């Protein structure tokens, strides 16, 4: 690469010494830049050097081949971000809402459910739940998820699902048909939903409970990809 870049450029007298000085300066710069991130590890630095060589050699030019400072300014981009990495998901609509419902089930307390989703009128005299009186100060999303039941998951999934697009035979609310259960099984088999782990689980038994295995970033991306404001449910307890 450097041979190509210099044959595409003009002459460079004192070739060997200047070349060695350029290499030493590059090594010193990369060490001083990423020592606090790679530690005293020879292998990580030896990989970063190879990673960031083909571009630094492209950024050089004749007017700063002998001026290290100006060359350093011209290649400041590849000295700040390490960049050592290679819709987020392609799930269906009902699975997309099913994951959100499972997250809500896992990271919320049942006693305060009625205060968040009751949205219909009453004929018989009755009262709703008063709700929480004080906010938690632990931000529960920093802890391990809790366990729930299939019935609560289905109920909340029905509650938060968007309304379905002579109304005596409308049946506005979504019902749990075959494909909902099929998509729930698909979610489980992709390791996005866990259960009480033992060999040869039997899905049909009261002694089986589920939980979630995705971090906050994935669920936030999924919620924002379907125009859902999940944070409003968690901002109240703690931002």
């Amino acid at each position: 690469c450097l041979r190509k870049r210099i044959i595409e450029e003009q002459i460079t007298d004192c070739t060997d010494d200047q070349f060695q000085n350029v290499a030493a300066n590059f090594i010193h710069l990369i060490v001083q830049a990423f020592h606090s991130y790679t530690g005293n590890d020879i292998f990580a630095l030896n990989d970063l050097i190879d990673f960031k060589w083909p571009k630094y050699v492209s950024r050089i030019t004749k007017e700063n081949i002998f001026e290290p400072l100006a060359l350093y300014k011209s290649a400041i981009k590849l000295f700040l971000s390490t960049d050592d990495n290679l819709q987020t998901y392609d799930l269906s609509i009902i699975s997309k809402y099913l994951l959100i419902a499972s997250y809500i089930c896992s990271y919320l307390e049942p006693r305060y459910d009625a205060s968040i989703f009751s949205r219909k009128t009453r004929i018989i005299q009755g009262r709703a739940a008063y709700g929480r009186r004080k906010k938690k100060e632990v931000n529960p999303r920093y802890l391990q998820p809790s366990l729930f039941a299939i019935e609560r998951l289905l109920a909340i999934f029905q509650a938060i699902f968007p309304i379905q697009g002579s109304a005596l035979r409308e049946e506005s609310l979504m019902k749990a048909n075959i494909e909902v259960f099929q998509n729930l099984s698909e979610l489980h088999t992709l390791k996005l939903i866990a259960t009480t782990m033992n060999k040869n689980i039997d899905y049909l038994s009261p002694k089986v409970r589920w939980k979630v295995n995705v971090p906050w970033e994935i669920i936030k991306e999924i919620s924002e990809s379907v125009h859902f404001n999940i944070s409003d449910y968690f901002s109240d307890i703690h931002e």
Partner: protein
Amino acid sequence: SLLVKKYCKMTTEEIIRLCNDFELPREVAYKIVDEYNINASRLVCPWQLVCGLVLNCTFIVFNERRRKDPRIDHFIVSKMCSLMLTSKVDDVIECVKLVKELIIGEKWFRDLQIRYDDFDGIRYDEIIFRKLGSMLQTTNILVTDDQYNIWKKRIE
């Protein structure tokens, strides 16, 4: 109007008169009156309950006339909507739908449905075949014979 009224006052003479407008059979009227007293204590807008019961009973008992003439239900709902002192029609439908839930599994409702052979407006000989999933069911894509005969007679 009457729906918006909270904890109103009701008693027998207008309740029976509330059903004589549609000229319902007497037994249905007394059954409705008896049913009202059971749930009278726990109510907020009893006009809604009365509306729902009377409307469901009227649809149940006058299905034969409705089958022959599709136009009936329009003025059937419109007359009582006007009588209810409310211009909006969605309120009546929503209240009727709520009332239907509270009375779905009662013995006398089942007895009335069996006696009048309505079964959600479909004769029993058809609902069972629709439930099974037979391909030889009456698809609503052709004009049925009964309306065809009257249409042919009128156009003669």
